[PDB]
Ligand binder design. Structure first.
Ligand SMILES: [Mg+2]
Ligand SMILES: [Mg+2]
Ligand SMILES: [Mg+2]
Ligand SMILES: [Mg+2]
Ligand SMILES: [Mg+2]
Ligand SMILES: [Mg+2]
Ligand SMILES: [Mg+2]
Ligand SMILES: [Mg+2]
Ligand SMILES: [Mg+2]
Ligand SMILES: [Mg+2]
Ligand SMILES: [Mg+2]
Ligand SMILES: [Mg+2]
Ligand SMILES: [Zn+2]
Ligand SMILES: [Zn+2]
Lengths: 127, 214, 100, 82
RNA sequence: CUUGGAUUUAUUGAAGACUAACUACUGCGAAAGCAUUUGCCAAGGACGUUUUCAUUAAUCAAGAACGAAAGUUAGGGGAUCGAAGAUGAUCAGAUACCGUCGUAGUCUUAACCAUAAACUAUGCCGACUAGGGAUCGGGUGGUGUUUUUCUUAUGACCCACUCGGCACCUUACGAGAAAUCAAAGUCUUUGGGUUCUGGGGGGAGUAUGGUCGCAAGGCUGAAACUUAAAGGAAUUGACGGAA
């Protein structure tokens, strides 16, 4: 009965994605991003924008013909953060509100075994 | 201006019969137009889905299974356990401080030309009574355990022609065996397979594949 | 200038010079001892959002998993916000885990 | 242990506790366990810390496996003390 | 910065990197340093020992062995960060942060170099002095507990003692200028055995010569002249875009 997707929320700092796909992954549905719904450069990762994006994605899904999703969350990963952004949670909330159903939530952030050299240099990033 | 959302074709994902259900869900592709065909495009599509999705029960909500599309037969598309997996949020909780973990990787040619890499995580046990905050096994002991695990893998992969191996993996029999083997060296907790990766593969072997589904 | 501490970078004693770790926030190379290793075991869903998720969702009980991030901080960085918390001379000797 | 220990005669317990060296006089606590094998009726005066795959007088029976300290007496074997 | 879907989604391939989680007041190594696998190759401490030699021992100016990083020559690669350099803001200005990019490298392989806050800013060997628990590696004893294939026997703990290295509290009568120190104690109640180093600050790790180097530099190392303080530790303040 329930037609599924995989939500894929790439929640980096300074932008969020919501990238709904089929179960194989190849054929997408909607790729809606934070910077797409709020033209302010700053307001990309910002929650409201993320929420809007999520809503848009949901709408797209509805148009297509899908009922449920599998939340996968990706923080920037590897050389950066490994910390889910400000607007992943917000996006999720938005999705929930939309009524597009939810099943099996994961964080598939690519946390390495032993990364190749990080940002900054040795003395780091000195504001 | 094209818009290929109307120009689409929906197909149903057909799982192997080792699990409860032989049907995962619903994928899609473009039509089989001249020059670029549909079946061809399909053959080679990895559906990574939960093992609780297939089996039904929440005991196997600690697992995942990559499923590679091989044969496209009458819309429905037959897949093969291309991989077995743990999602990050399962094994991350099991790695806790103040107790040693034991990984074990094993390359194994099955009876068929299918080089399986099969992993095996196994944590060390905080015993009953223990006041030593730590439960660290000696390096030597750990090594021994790893060796044992490898041996086990060699025994039970290689043998039984790959399909059967998957089935065996399914309800943790291998893990249990490993645990049993260990108990003389060191007690251990959990003990799992974690992943299954795959290298080589021969001609598609269509008849054989079919003989799974029936 | 006298020694503030006996330990200093702490774990390095009878350990020549250990391997290092990169900080989360700064990406400053900090030795994996003078490190400040807080363990962020957050739930994958936001507190108020959990209810929403439940309302949305299929199944019962659910995974509702936790993300696991062992965060390393370059001392200075930690002092700006994190668990550090500048103590008095006599209070520095106390190594017991705070709160609790 | 404080002020007036009276050091020539300790209680034997203390001596037992302390290192085989760090008493009044040096005196070891290794023993010549007089082992009998299951086979031939003859007694081998086996030093308890063998350092050797201890055969019998002639027959290849294997009496004691030399563990780092005291020897594990291989299988169901019987022994006298010293 | 692209959109003539870059990014994002999914399978691969190539390359050389690294080797998280594990990871601790944890372990080893003469230090520098060393954490995936298995294997190989030798060496090593601790231990245990009713084994064997009998002064072979302790420390060391000559000389020797190693020796982080960078740099260097010469080879491979180059992902990111990234001295150089481009470049975008900010300020009276700012070739500075911040920002974006990013040759050399970073990483490696063959040669060097021989320096570090190579810092425990604590030479080594020896002995003795006060409590305590732990903690790693050995080794004893427990009709202790569980494993369970019936007694088991290994294993793994529990407890006590044992020797061993990378580790708290009080009084110090011992110390110490004090922070503090169970050694930095057994020193004007001055002598266990040794090597090395220092003699107000600067001038100066310079000049010079030696010597060592491909170089960069290293080891070695002045004086003239100058100057009343330079330091250390803490105390009270004042202050801090610290809490
Ligand atoms: Mg200061
Ligand atoms: Mg000074
Ligand atoms: Mg050491
Ligand atoms: Mg060092
Ligand atoms: Mg260790
Ligand atoms: Mg590892
Ligand atoms: Mg010399
Ligand atoms: Mg170099
Ligand atoms: Mg820069
Ligand atoms: Mg400028
Ligand atoms: Mg002078
Ligand atoms: Mg001062
Ligand atoms: Zn930082
Ligand atoms: Zn005989």
């Amino acid at each position: 009965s329930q037609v599924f997707g995989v939500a894929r929320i790439f929640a980096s700092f300074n932008d969020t994605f919501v990238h709904v796909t089929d179960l194989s992954g190849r054929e997408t549905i909607a790729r809606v991003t934070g910077g797409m719904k709020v033209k302010a450069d700053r307001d990309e990762s910002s929650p409201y924008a993320a929420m809007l994006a999520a809503q848009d994605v949901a709408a797209k899904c509805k148009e297509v013909g899908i009922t449920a999703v599998h939340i996968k969350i990706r923080a920037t990963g590897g050389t950066r953060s490994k910390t889910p952004g400000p607007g992943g949670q917000a996006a999720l909330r938005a999705l929930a509100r939309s009524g597009l159903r939810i099943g099996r939530i994961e964080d598939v952030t690519p946390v390495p075994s032993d990364s190749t050299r990080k940002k900054g240099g040795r003395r780091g990033r000195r504001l | 201006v094209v818009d290929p959302f109307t120009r689409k074709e929906w197909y149903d994902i057909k799982a192997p019969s080792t699990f409860e259900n032989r049907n995962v869900g619903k994928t899609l592709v473009n039509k089989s137009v001249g020059l670029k065909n549909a079946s061809d495009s399909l053959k080679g599509r990895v559906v990574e889905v939960c093992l609780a999705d297939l089996q039904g029960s929440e005991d196997h909500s600690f697992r995942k299974v990559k499923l590679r599309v091989d044969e496209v037969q009458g819309k429905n598309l037959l897949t093969n356990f291309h991989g077995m997996d743990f999602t990050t949020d399962k094994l991350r909780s099991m790695v806790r401080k103040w107790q040693t973990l034991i990984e074990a990787n094993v390359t194994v040619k099955t009876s068929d030309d299918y080089v399986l890499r099969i992993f095996a995580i196994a944590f060390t046990r905080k015993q009953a009574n223990q006041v030593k905050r730590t439960s660290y096994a000696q390096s030597s002991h750990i090594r021994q355990i790893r060796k044992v695990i490898s041996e086990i893998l060699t025994r039970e992969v290689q043998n039984s022609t790959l399909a059967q191996l998957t089935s065996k993996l399914i309800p943790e029999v291998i893990n249990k065996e490993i645990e049993n083997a260990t108990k003389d060296i060191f007690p251990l907790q959990n003990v799992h397979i974690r992943k299954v990766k795959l290298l080589k593969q021969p001609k598609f072997d269509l008849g054989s594949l079919l003989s799974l589904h029936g | 200038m006298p020694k503030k501490r006996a330990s200093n970078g702490r774990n390095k004693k009878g350990r020549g010079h250990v391997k290092p770790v990169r900080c989360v926030n700064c990406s400053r190379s900090v030795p994996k001892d003078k490190a400040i290793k807080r363990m962020a075991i957050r739930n994958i869903v936001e507190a108020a959002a959990i209810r929403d998720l439940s309302e949305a969702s299929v199944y019962a009980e659910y995974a509702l998993p936790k993300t696991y991030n062992k965060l390393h901080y370059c001392i200075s960085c930690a002092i700006h916000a994190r668990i550090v918390r500048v103590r008095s001379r006599t209070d520095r000797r106390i190594r017991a885990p705070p709160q609790r | 242990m404080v002020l007036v220990q009276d050091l020539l005669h300790p209680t034997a317990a203390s001596e037992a506790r302390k290192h085989k060296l760090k008493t009044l006089v040096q005196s070891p606590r290794s023993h010549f366990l007089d082992v009998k094998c299951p086979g031939c009726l003859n007694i081998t005066t086996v030093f308890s810390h063998a350092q050797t795959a201890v055969t019998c007088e002639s027959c290849s029976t294997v009496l004691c496996t030399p563990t780092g300290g005291k020897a594990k007496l291989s299988e169901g074997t019987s022994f006298r003390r010293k």
